[PDB]
Amino acid sequence: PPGPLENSSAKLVNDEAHPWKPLRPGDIRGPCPGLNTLASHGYLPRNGVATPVQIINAVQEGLNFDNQAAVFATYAAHLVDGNLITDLLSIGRKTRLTGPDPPPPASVGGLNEHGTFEGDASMTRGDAFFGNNHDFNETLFEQLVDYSNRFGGGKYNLTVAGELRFKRIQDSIATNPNFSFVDFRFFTAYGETTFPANLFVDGRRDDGQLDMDAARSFFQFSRMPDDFFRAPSPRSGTGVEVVIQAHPMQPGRNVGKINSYTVDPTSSDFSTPCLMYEKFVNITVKSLYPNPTVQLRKALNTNLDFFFQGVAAGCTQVFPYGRD
Amino acid sequence: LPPGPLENSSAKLVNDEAHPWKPLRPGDIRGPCPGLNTLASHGYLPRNGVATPVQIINAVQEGLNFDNQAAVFATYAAHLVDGNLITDLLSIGRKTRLTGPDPPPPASVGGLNEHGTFEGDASMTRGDAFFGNNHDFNETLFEQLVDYSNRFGGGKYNLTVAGELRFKRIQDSIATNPNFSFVDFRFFTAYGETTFPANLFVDGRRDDGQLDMDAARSFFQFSRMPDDFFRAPSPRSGTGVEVVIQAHPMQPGRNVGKINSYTVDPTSSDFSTPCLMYEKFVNITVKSLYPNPTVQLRKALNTNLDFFFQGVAAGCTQVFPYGR
Numbered sequence: 001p002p003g004p005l006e007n008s009s010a011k012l013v014n015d016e017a018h019p020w021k022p023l024r025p026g027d028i029r030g031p032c033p034g035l036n037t038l039a040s041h042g043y044l045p046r047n048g049v050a051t052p053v054q055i056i057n058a059v060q061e062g063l064n065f066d067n068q069a070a071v072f073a074t075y076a077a078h079l080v081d082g083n084l085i086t087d088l089l090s091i092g093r094k095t096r097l098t099g100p101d102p103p104p105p106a107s108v109g110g111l112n113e114h115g116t117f118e119g120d121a122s123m124t125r126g127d128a129f130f131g132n133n134h135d136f137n138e139t140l141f142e143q144l145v146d147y148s149n150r151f152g153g154g155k156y157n158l159t160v161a162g163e164l165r166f167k168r169i170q171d172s173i174a175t176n177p178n179f180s181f182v183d184f185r186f187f188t189a190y191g192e193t194t195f196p197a198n199l200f201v202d203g204r205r206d207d208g209q210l211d212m213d214a215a216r217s218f219f220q221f222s223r224m225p226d227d228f229f230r231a232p233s234p235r236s237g238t239g240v241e242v243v244i245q246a247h248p249m250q251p252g253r254n255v256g257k258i259n260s261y262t263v264d265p266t267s268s269d270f271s272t273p274c275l276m277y278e279k280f281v282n283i284t285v286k287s288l289y290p291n292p293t294v295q296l297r298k299a300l301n302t303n304l305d306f307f308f309q310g311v312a313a314g315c316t317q318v319f320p321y322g323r324d
Numbered sequence: 325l326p327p328g329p330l331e332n333s334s335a336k337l338v339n340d341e342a343h344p345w346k347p348l349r350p351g352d353i354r355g356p357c358p359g360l361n362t363l364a365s366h367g368y369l370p371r372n373g374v375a376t377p378v379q380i381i382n383a384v385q386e387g388l389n390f391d392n393q394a395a396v397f398a399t400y401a402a403h404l405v406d407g408n409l410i411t412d413l414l415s416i417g418r419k420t421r422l423t424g425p426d427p428p429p430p431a432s433v434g435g436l437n438e439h440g441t442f443e444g445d446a447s448m449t450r451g452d453a454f455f456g457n458n459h460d461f462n463e464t465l466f467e468q469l470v471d472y473s474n475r476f477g478g479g480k481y482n483l484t485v486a487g488e489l490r491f492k493r494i495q496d497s498i499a500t501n502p503n504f505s506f507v508d509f510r511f512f513t514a515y516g517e518t519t520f521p522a523n524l525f526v527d528g529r530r531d532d533g534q535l536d537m538d539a540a541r542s543f544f545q546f547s548r549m550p551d552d553f554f555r556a557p558s559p560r561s562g563t564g565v566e567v568v569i570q571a572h573p574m575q576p577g578r579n580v581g582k583i584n585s586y587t588v589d590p591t592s593s594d595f596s597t598p599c600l601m602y603e604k605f606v607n608i609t610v611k612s613l614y615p616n617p618t619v620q621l622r623k624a625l626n627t628n629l630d631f632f633f634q635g636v637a638a639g640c641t642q643v644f645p646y647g648r
């Protein structure tokens with residue numbers, strides 16, 4: 001697992017060695033505009049299948065994503081969505097490129113796999129319930145623009161993030177009878193809304209105000225603006241507290257029908273990051289791998305260790321298969 | 325310019341042969357900040373505790389891996405209100421002739437000890453200014469930190485301990501300090517500070533956010549790094565502050581001339597309005613110290629207000645109290 005950038009100042013990353021290209025048939029793109037754009041500028045394999053080490057070097061070098069967040073997000077995703085023997089992860093749909101599957105109920109389903117990492121009330125993608133959880137959706141993007149106009153002076157910023165995050169949750173509650181918003185997804189849904197203001201903003205300026213042309217380029221086409229400079233120093237979810245505090249929300253879920261959102265008092269929330277860590281490892285990962293062979297157990301323990309090092313709140317390490 | 329981010333920001337020995345702890349030698353100034361005190365006491369900063377903004381940022385980054393945005397934000401904020409803008413020198417403690425000849429009233433140039441500019445109420449290990457001394461280590465407060473760590477962190481200080489102690493300290497001040505104030509700048513900074521010991525005082529080889537009480541006392545009381553201390557393995561500052569905020573959500577306010585009269589102030593900024601915090605700091609705090617400044621002082625203010633703006637986490641739009 002790579003350490004932080006050696007030299008992490010702003011610099012042009014839309015450069016000569018990293019041109020955008022269109023998708024070839026077979027090139028895999030998914031629900032993350034950050035990984036998508038990196039793949040499309042060749043910071044990641046252009047076909048969208050990568051090792052964890054590759055994804056981490058790419059997000060730091062391409063966009064100056066900080067090391068702790070890159071390590072948390074990448075090994076969390078690899079544990080639930082990736083192939084632990086081959087050490088590969090698809091950034092979108094399940095693919096044979098990741099090699100021979102483990103036994104069920106592990107899915108190795110790529111970032112597109114619903115319920116594991118990816119989840120509901122995304123900004124520019126529709127819920128899995130309605131059929132397609134990974135393609136750019138134009139109606140939701142035009143909503144992001146609207147809110148930018150109304151709260152951001154035409155630009156996306158943390159204030160807009162706060163408003164739209166809530167709007168999307170409300171939208172899901174009213175329309176999605178499967179709406180779920182607990183645990184891992186509750187956590188990551190709020191930190192994602194800060195990323196575009198933090199990281200899609202040209203680094204020479206770095207003033208957290210994202211223009212709509214830049215926003216469309218990343219979200220829709222996986223493409224950096226012309227002459228794009230990365231952020232002037234490493235960061236990820238700075239300001240998430242702005243987005244949480246705008247519209248206080250307790251973790252919960254619709255119960256088999258629309259508008260039935262019911263708080264779940266067993267879910268972690270922001271005051272309990274280590275319950276969220278423990279349930280991810282001790283319930284989510286453990287249920288995908290309830291009885292691993294010696295070889296799989298050893299791959300699981302190595303990735304669980306690397307995952308534990310990226311956990312922002314620190315926490316106490318949990319061992320689903322033992323320390324041995 | 326402010327220094328940019330650290331070249332190679334990995335974990336490494338920082339309590340080394342070139343940076344030993346030394347006892348205070350009269351002349352030497354120590355203040356309310358255990359981070360800055362300890363850096364001065366190991367020679368990362370000047371040992372007498374008076375430094376330029378550039379020295380302080382280089383010191384917090386190289387000594388402790390404090391991240392660049394936070395180092396710039398705090399350093400220029402404190403310099404604007406507590407420092408000498410003409411000599412370019414800031415005391416980490418008391419007001420001193422070592423920062424040079426003063427500007428005109430009503431500027432104070434009072435050092436970091438100056439109550440209510442940067443320093444303020446409900447500190448963890450230091451008493452409120454109202455009771456007499458806002459900067460000395462207070463053994464009864466540290467013992468209550470040790471007690472909350474036994475109760476909530478298994479004997480170690482971590483973000484769960486921080487959430488409970490931060491709220492305890494606020495309740496102590498409401499009950500005992502008739503002047504307690506907890507608005508605007510202080511309301512914002514108080515929360516982030518409670519994360520720093522978990523993120524930054526924990527040996528960088530471990531980096532699991534569990535701070536032992538011997539390490540904690542070393543930094544807070546003696547201004548000394550633990551033996552063989554490694555700084556954190558990448559840059560960070562207020563990671564996990566939302567964990568502290570959401571443990572006991574609370575709005576900004578003040579006692580109203582007597583104990584137990586905490587009154588929410590609806591004109592204060594809070595965590596959802598970080599740009600109003602920025603703006604009030606500049607329009608009100610800074611500009612009432614320097615209501616009408618001469619030509620050279622006006623240049624120095626505008627230069628430092630620029631650097632300050634670049635450090636604002638939320639991004640925001642720049643305000644210009646003296647024009648552009």
Ligand SMILES: *[C@@H]1O[C@H](CO)[C@@H](O[C@@H]2O[C@H](CO)[C@@H](O[C@@H]3O[C@H](CO[C@H]4O[C@H](CO[C@H]5O[C@H](CO)[C@@H](O)[C@H](O)[C@@H]5O[C@H]5O[C@H](CO)[C@@H](O)[C@H](O)[C@@H]5O)[C@@H](O)[C@H](O[C@H]5O[C@H](CO)[C@@H](O)[C@H](O)[C@@H]5O)[C@@H]4O)[C@@H](O)[C@H](O[C@H]4O[C@H](CO)[C@@H](O)[C@H](O)[C@@H]4O)[C@@H]3O)[C@H](O)[C@H]2NC(C)=O)[C@H](O)[C@H]1NC(C)=O
Pocket residue numbers: 451452455457462463464465495496499500501502582583
């Ligand atoms: C190092 O720092 C420490 C701490 O800052 C310094 O010591 C402090 O010094 C100040 C200044 O002298 C003292 O201020 C004075 O406080 C007294 C009140 O004392 C008693 O009540 C205190 C508050 O308790 C309530 O709130 C807390 C916090 O939530 C809570 O835990 C308590 O249980 C109680 O809560 C109430 O409300 C709750 C709802 O939230 C309810 O559940 C509950 O039912 C309660 O009703 C308390 O902390 C204090 O406890 C200490 O002292 C006793 C022994 O006396 C000891 O047994 C405890 O273990 C503690 O050690 C007391 O119980 C107040 O009366 C004074 O008010 C006078 O003066 C002010 C200011 O001038 C005037 O405005 C008033 O009108 C009045 O004349 C005063 O404000 C502070 O109490 C003290 N704290 C300590 C010692 O812990 C120390 O000085 C510093 N050292 C150095 C060297 O500087």
Ligand SMILES: *[C@@H]1O[C@H](CO)[C@@H](O[C@@H]2O[C@H](CO)[C@@H](O[C@@H]3O[C@H](CO[C@H]4O[C@H](CO)[C@@H](O)[C@H](O)[C@@H]4O)[C@@H](O)[C@H](O[C@H]4O[C@H](CO)[C@@H](O)[C@H](O)[C@@H]4O)[C@@H]3O)[C@H](O)[C@H]2NC(C)=O)[C@H](O)[C@H]1NC(C)=O
Pocket residue numbers: 150151152153157158159160208598599600603638639640641
């Ligand atoms: C992102 O970009 C925006 C614009 O550049 C920045 O500026 C903030 O913009 C916000 C959002 O529009 C402003 O907040 C709004 O201000 C309105 C007026 O505020 C004053 O006047 C009213 C009287 O009408 C007073 O009551 C109030 O106390 C203020 O003195 C308010 O009417 C708005 O409140 C209401 O809005 C919604 C609309 O959907 C209502 O439904 C609610 O009831 C709500 O109460 C709103 O607060 C804000 O003033 C701007 N801030 C500043 C400092 O200028 C953001 O700063 C920028 N963000 C970042 C992180 O960069």
Ligand code: HEM
Pocket residue numbers: 031032033034035055059063065069070071073074077111117118119120121122123124125192193195196199200
């Ligand atoms: C570090 C490896 C990363 C992984 C494994 C990862 C994975 C994901 C996944 C699976 C989603 C979908 C969540 C949802 O359902 O909405 C997502 C969303 C998101 N990602 Fe990433 N991501 C990573 C890095 C990045 C980077 C570097 C950026 C920005 C620089 C970023 C920006 C975002 C944003 C803005 C979304 C939300 C998009 C939306 O809601 O429309 N990600 N990420």
Ligand code: HEM
Pocket residue numbers: 356357358359360380381384388390394395396398399402436442443444445446447448449450517518520521524525
């Ligand atoms: C970068 C320049 C910095 C400045 C200008 C600065 C200034 C301050 C000031 C004025 C206070 C007192 C606030 C109060 O409690 O009343 C404070 C508190 C504190 N600082 Fe800093 N600080 C800096 C860097 C850091 C660093 C690098 C660390 C640790 C790595 C740190 C750790 C803390 C902690 C833990 C407190 C609270 C102490 C307490 O509540 O007992 N600071 N700082």
Ligand SMILES: *[C@@H]1O[C@H](CO)[C@@H](O[C@@H]2O[C@H](CO)[C@@H](O[C@@H]3O[C@H](CO)[C@@H](O)[C@H](O)[C@@H]3O)[C@H](O)[C@H]2NC(C)=O)[C@H](O)[C@H]1NC(C)=O
Pocket residue numbers: 128129130178
């Ligand atoms: C709304 O949520 C429900 C409940 O999660 C979704 O139904 C579930 O769909 C999954 C995935 O297709 C099913 O699990 C699979 O079942 C097949 C064959 O039945 C099995 O061979 C697979 O290995 C896997 O078990 C499952 O039947 C079902 N879960 C239930 C009923 O608890 C439902 O599809 C969602 N609705 C929409 C429109 O998305």
Ligand SMILES: *[C@@H]1O[C@H](CO)[C@@H](O[C@@H]2O[C@H](CO)[C@@H](O[C@@H]3O[C@H](CO)[C@@H](O)[C@H](O)[C@@H]3O)[C@H](O)[C@H]2NC(C)=O)[C@H](O)[C@H]1NC(C)=O
Pocket residue numbers: 126132137138139140
């Ligand atoms: C992009 O996202 C938008 C908004 O989230 C999706 O639009 C939604 O589409 C449904 C139908 O697919 C619209 O309502 C439908 O109305 C009929 C009545 O004839 C009803 O029988 C259906 O059950 C359904 O309710 C819905 O109003 C619309 N929501 C909007 C516009 O806010 C859209 O499907 C997404 N695009 C893609 C390609 O998925």
Ligand SMILES: *[C@@H]1O[C@H](CO)[C@@H](O[C@@H]2O[C@H](CO)[C@@H](O)[C@H](O)[C@H]2NC(C)=O)[C@H](O)[C@H]1NC(C)=O
Pocket residue numbers: 453454455502503581
């Ligand atoms: C606590 O605040 C009080 C009230 O603001 C202060 O004392 C008063 O305020 C001014 C100072 O600005 C004094 O000149 C008045 O005589 C005081 N009395 C009243 C009724 O206003 C005082 O500055 C603070 N006390 C301490 C110890 O810091």
Ligand SMILES: *[C@@H]1O[C@H](CO)[C@@H](O[C@@H]2O[C@H](CO)[C@@H](O)[C@H](O)[C@H]2NC(C)=O)[C@H](O)[C@H]1NC(C)=O
Pocket residue numbers: 273274275278313314315316475476477478482483484485533
């Ligand atoms: C702070 O340390 C404590 C103990 O090491 C951790 O708290 C425990 O959390 C477990 C599950 O992780 C719960 O059963 C208890 O509520 C906790 N034990 C207690 C309170 O004695 C806590 O997670 C740590 N916090 C962080 C952020 O690392």
Ligand SMILES: *[C@@H]1O[C@H](CO)[C@@H](O[C@@H]2O[C@H](CO)[C@@H](O)[C@H](O)[C@H]2NC(C)=O)[C@H](O)[C@H]1NC(C)=O
Pocket residue numbers: 428429430615616617618
């Ligand atoms: C511009 O600022 C200067 C001070 O830098 C002002 O000087 C005033 O001097 C009087 C003398 O009694 C003081 O009492 C005031 O406090 C000072 N004013 C201020 C605002 O601090 C001078 O008056 C100001 N000139 C203009 C045109 O505003």
Ligand SMILES: *[C@@H]1O[C@H](CO)[C@@H](O[C@@H]2O[C@H](CO)[C@@H](O)[C@H](O)[C@H]2NC(C)=O)[C@H](O)[C@H]1NC(C)=O
Pocket residue numbers: 600603604607643644645
């Ligand atoms: C702080 O001061 C600035 C101006 O120095 C404030 O006023 C706004 O400034 C912008 C930028 O030039 C103008 O577009 C607006 O027209 C200004 N408003 C007014 C009423 O003139 C800003 O609002 C101030 N903020 C606070 C909280 O005091």
Ligand SMILES: CC(=O)N[C@@H]1[C@@H](O)[C@H](O)[C@@H](CO)O[C@H]1O
Pocket residue numbers: 440503504505506507508577578579589
């Ligand atoms: C506008 C503002 O910031 N006012 C605070 C106030 O709420 C508090 O009562 C006062 C005296 O202790 O200190 C001021 O700094």
Ligand SMILES: *[C@@H]1O[C@H](CO)[C@@H](O)[C@H](O)[C@H]1NC(C)=O
Pocket residue numbers: 007008009010011331
């Ligand atoms: C670090 O990165 C930037 C952009 O390449 C450059 O300005 C700076 O000198 C580099 N520092 C080095 C290579 O030491």
Ligand SMILES: *[C@@H]1O[C@H](CO)[C@@H](O)[C@H](O)[C@H]1NC(C)=O
Pocket residue numbers: 278279282318319320
């Ligand atoms: C996970 O397992 C660990 C150790 O066996 C245990 O401490 C913890 O309670 C478990 N977590 C849950 C939520 O069951």
Ligand SMILES: *[C@@H]1O[C@H](CO)[C@@H](O)[C@H](O)[C@H]1NC(C)=O
Pocket residue numbers: 290291
């Ligand atoms: C291991 O036990 C779990 C119980 O959760 C079961 O699902 C899994 O199939 C078991 N595996 C064996 C050894 O095949």
Ligand SMILES: *[C@@H]1O[C@H](CO)[C@@H](O)[C@H](O)[C@H]1NC(C)=O
Pocket residue numbers: 003332333334335
């Ligand atoms: C840079 O960090 C690496 C990572 O551990 C380390 O090996 C090396 O000693 C550092 N380089 C310098 C010049 O300090």
Ligand SMILES: OC[C@H]1O[C@@H](O)[C@@H](O)[C@@H](O)[C@@H]1O
Pocket residue numbers: 001052053087299302303306
């Ligand atoms: O143990 C070293 C390697 O182990 C694998 O399991 C991976 O997931 C890598 O990221 C790691 O570098």
